[PDB]
Design a protein around this nucleic acid. Sequence first.
DNA 1: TGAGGATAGTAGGTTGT
DNA 2: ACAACCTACTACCTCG
DNA 3: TGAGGATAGTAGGTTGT
DNA 4: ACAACCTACTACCTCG
Lengths: 679, 679
Amino acid sequence: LGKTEVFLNRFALRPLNPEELRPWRLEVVLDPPPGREEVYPLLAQVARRAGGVTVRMGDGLASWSPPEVLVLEGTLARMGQTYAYRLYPKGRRPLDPKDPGERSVLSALARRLLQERLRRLEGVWVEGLAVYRREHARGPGWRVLGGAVLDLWVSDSGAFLLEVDPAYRILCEMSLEAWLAQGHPLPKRVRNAYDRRTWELLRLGEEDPKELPLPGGLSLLDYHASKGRLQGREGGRVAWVADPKDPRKPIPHLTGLLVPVLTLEDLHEEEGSLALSLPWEERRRRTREIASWIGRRLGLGTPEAVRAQAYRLSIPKLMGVSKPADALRVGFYRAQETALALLRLDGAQGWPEFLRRALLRAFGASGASLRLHTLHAHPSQGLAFREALRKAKEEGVQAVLVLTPPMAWEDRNRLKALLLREGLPSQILNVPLREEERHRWENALLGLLAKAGLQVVALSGAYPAELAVGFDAGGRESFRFGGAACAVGGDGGHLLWTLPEAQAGERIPQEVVWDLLEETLWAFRRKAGRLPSRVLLLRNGRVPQDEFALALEALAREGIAYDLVSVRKSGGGRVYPVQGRLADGLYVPLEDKTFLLLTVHRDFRGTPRPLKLVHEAGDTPLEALAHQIFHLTRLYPASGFAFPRLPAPLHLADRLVKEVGRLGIRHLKEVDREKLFFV
Amino acid sequence: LGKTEVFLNRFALRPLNPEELRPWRLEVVLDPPPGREEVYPLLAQVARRAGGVTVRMGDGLASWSPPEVLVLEGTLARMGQTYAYRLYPKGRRPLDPKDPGERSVLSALARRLLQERLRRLEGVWVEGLAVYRREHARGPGWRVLGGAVLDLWVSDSGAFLLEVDPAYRILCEMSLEAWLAQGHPLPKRVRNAYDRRTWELLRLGEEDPKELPLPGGLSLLDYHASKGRLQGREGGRVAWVADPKDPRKPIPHLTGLLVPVLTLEDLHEEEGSLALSLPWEERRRRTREIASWIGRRLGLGTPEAVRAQAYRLSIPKLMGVSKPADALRVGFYRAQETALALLRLDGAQGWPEFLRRALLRAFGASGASLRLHTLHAHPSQGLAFREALRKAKEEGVQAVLVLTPPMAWEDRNRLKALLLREGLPSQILNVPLREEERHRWENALLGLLAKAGLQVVALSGAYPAELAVGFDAGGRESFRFGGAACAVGGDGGHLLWTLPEAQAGERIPQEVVWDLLEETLWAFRRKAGRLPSRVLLLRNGRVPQDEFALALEALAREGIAYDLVSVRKSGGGRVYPVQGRLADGLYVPLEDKTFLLLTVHRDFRGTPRPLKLVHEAGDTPLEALAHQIFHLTRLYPASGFAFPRLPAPLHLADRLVKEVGRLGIRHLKEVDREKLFFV
DNA sequence: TGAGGATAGTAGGTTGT
DNA sequence: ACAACCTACTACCTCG
DNA sequence: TGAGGATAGTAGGTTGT
DNA sequence: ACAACCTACTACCTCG
Ligand SMILES: [Mg+2]
Ligand SMILES: [Mg+2]
């Protein structure tokens, strides 16, 4: 295909002198000894109380600072039991940089080296591994300061590596009554002047704090005064705050002692649009700069921006198209005779003429007969909705649209719960709505359309796989949801999903994971007529150890090839063009069976965040994976102009679980897996 | 109805003297003060380090011991942050016994008083609030010492209340090598001689402990000798134990230092398998006895066994019948034209024509046609099962039957996962069945036939509700499943179930709770032709506060009456007939709106465990609820001779969640709610 | 509930030595 | 602890 | 994987002051 | 903690 070289935010630092290679090690002995469950954290707690630049190593600690300056004896409380530890030093033994586990110690030694160095400079703001040396913009109340997040680790080469990404931070120092005093609206949240605890503001209130009632038989002005908060400051106006953990019940508070906590929505009254989002040319300009400023401070030598070769993936064409929205009026890759319905409580309304026209123009271009219909909804008793479903059943229903005043989630889901029971997919455009914002109706329908298959574009390129499936965990924080979406066809794709299953954790049961992948193998021969030669195995996030083991074997037994790749948004740094403009689609090899892949980038959203991908299993070339993987990004049909960063099975998959974890799956029998009901 | 009086295991004790009403209270002050997350547990830790007879009382402790003997200053570590506490006494102040919260403290005071008294007597075995004074049965290795579980609480009346239930304990004092020495099979589990930790036993290889190799530069024999456990014992034969938490991989160990942990399976070789379950007339005899022995030790005067008035409930004329097995030969309350299929991997070639005969006759006495088809299944590819369900679907598969060599749970569930995928209920009987021993086949299929939807029996009685629904939380330990089952007609019963939904806790979402009850209200009038005038609201376990609030309101809105009751398996009672024989069905009003209900009892399976029931909401009489409740006990089809203790919606529900919790929910799309697939 | 991303921001979780 | 990843909210932004 | 219950036994969890 | 309740295993038992 094609090629360009890319800078990376990583930097090249000094090769490690010997006295770093050889850390003093200290054997830990502690009373009472701890059962293995508590041992790794007890040691880390020891690494911090011992002090110095020390980190746990195995059943002992390693330390770049000599034992003569470490606190070798003391006490620590972990869980309930309280322990005393002692440390018995030993002469230092070199550590192998090739050995992962010993470089894990020289990496941690490097993290804690860099961090110790950061405290000792002033006047700088340091927040863990993030440093903030400059001042982006100033307001009377506030300032926002600037800098980057750092990391200093050790490579296999035995040299120090530096990672820089610029990040900003907002600093409000005014009280709540002064911030209000400039006629600015109340902040979403708010913090005690005297401490960390953060409230959530509700209303200003009227009462006189000298006269207000407290359960204590004390007064608001008095209670705070007793506790001595208001020697520095004067309380003034009475605020009503409420705890985020439990919003009920409102708790009284004096504004003079609350501090607003600002966001861009509070900052934008004072600064219009403040570019916290950095344009790639400036981000890359700050990264190089700041890294020099570290290196001039650190003494690890001058950094040489690490460069990686890179390759431009072939542009992927949706078809009938440059953006799916362009496709909406004209012919879809596929079209089917279809029916749709309208129901809502403005109330009440009629279907307007403009919506139909768009549907007609597209049906007209493609050549497929279009229907539309009406429905009328009673929500207080709710009985009819089923009766509708039977009438909605024929002919036809394949997706449904609603518009109402926007609802509180508790009300929004409860209506989405009652919606699904009768087997209806649904989409909302909050109203009132106008032709004035076209996009809110163009994409709110483009989602309804996929909500009856399909508004699809499918690739025309040549790809080694001919079936793609996506897996992730989503849903309540307490336990997760494993589900899966799928892409049918090597050249002409199709979109469908699999009911997810409840597990206690991120790990997906091996037995299930294969079961769903199997459920997508049934799909290929549903019309494909044969077993797909090769299937594509992506994973959202990390891939757990051998979670696929059952699944990949069971492919081989049934005669199907495969490749397995990890997709993680979080890892993988940043990618800058060594010369020239930036480009929307890229592959960088990096090392071995891992590569970075840039699925999306616009000149105006800021610097793009590139995917890190490892080839976990399978034989196909990395470039081949990128070549399909990049094109896969485009196929999403509920985004008329924006392309998810995750290819649709993962992205579709992300939606599927999250909606499933907010909605539930109780009522989802009647709904088809043709629907693509989440969007 | 009918009438008899009953004793209760509770005992009348002394009215509290004043010096017990008036406990000393101590106010707590602790540095640092804790957030309210940690305040109740920190105070309890305080009441425990303070010593004496002390318990938490809100902001401060309360104490039956004078401060002058309490430890008023010390340290305590909770959650990894240590605290010093001080206590300041404040005279004493009487506590109201009518106030629940102050009697909660006097109840706690009573608990810790009883417990402090139990330690000070000898030679008794005391295990928390459980005490063991006499020796039931001796083996050369073991003893099974006996006694009762107690509790001592304060009444609204102001007098101490005593609850006694006799319980036994098995204490084995001898090493693993000697217990094997008497030619007895290896216990399922085993414990360290030198400590609490217990292992799970596996095998004992031939390795010679003097030369077996430890992961360290050590040897099994030499290892334990290093730690000096061998001073009082000899190691002898090598054992191979395995950790329960992670069974792989086997861990080596010396039998001379392990101790078998015996159950009634291991005592049964020695003791003619004596069953710890007492006969009701001995257990009753022990309760009175033991309470006297306590009472003569306690100094609260003499206990008077508390009696409660009691009434005999209606005997269900299940139809029609005396036992649902009786129904099997005769006509079912609802025979329907029906089909069955057969598959197995034993593999027996064929259907054996003794089972068929029984099926035909009942369908030939009722007058209902029937068929039994055949199936053949390939498990290596499994594709065919899909072709079977299409054949099976028409017209033969109402329910299915398999028989297979005993399956590990991993393999057992994995096959049942496959079973559902094609919407196939299933029932196993292991190979090898022998016709001669009927019950395993007679009930194995009474489970398969209700898995077709015949309702074997229904009552003839007159009941105030005409629809009964059951709710429980069931599933994995980490997160729970909420499901519901129901009974269609008061006069004539039907059995069906509702899909379950996944939650993080015992609380079932009001929005789901009502949604399910609504799904059983939708069901009733599928053929009822009316709204049910009254519906029955039972709950498994406690009813969380206001879980039902949305549900009960939404009833009253749609014109339906209701009554609400809490059913607690472990709700506390034991009931004894003051005179005469014990009987199967009973109702006792307790002073509160709650009542005890004895759903099942057999003269041979021990003292029965009666149900505690509160009337939470509604207006029907307690007797009426019991009167319906006790009959619903029997409706369960799937037990040929034995009647569940929970009425079938609750019981069916428990089974419903549990299978869902291990099987899953994802495969089960096709299966009908008709099926009753779990059993 | 309009879509996507990338900014700060909240308040966390799991996996695996 | 800890690392490298995930979770699910709100609130800027402009429309390949 | 035979049904239920009641015995001991394991190894825990939730809810609500 | 703590209480009063639940959870899901195995292993006796005999067939309302
Ligand atoms: Mg978005
Ligand atoms: Mg049983």
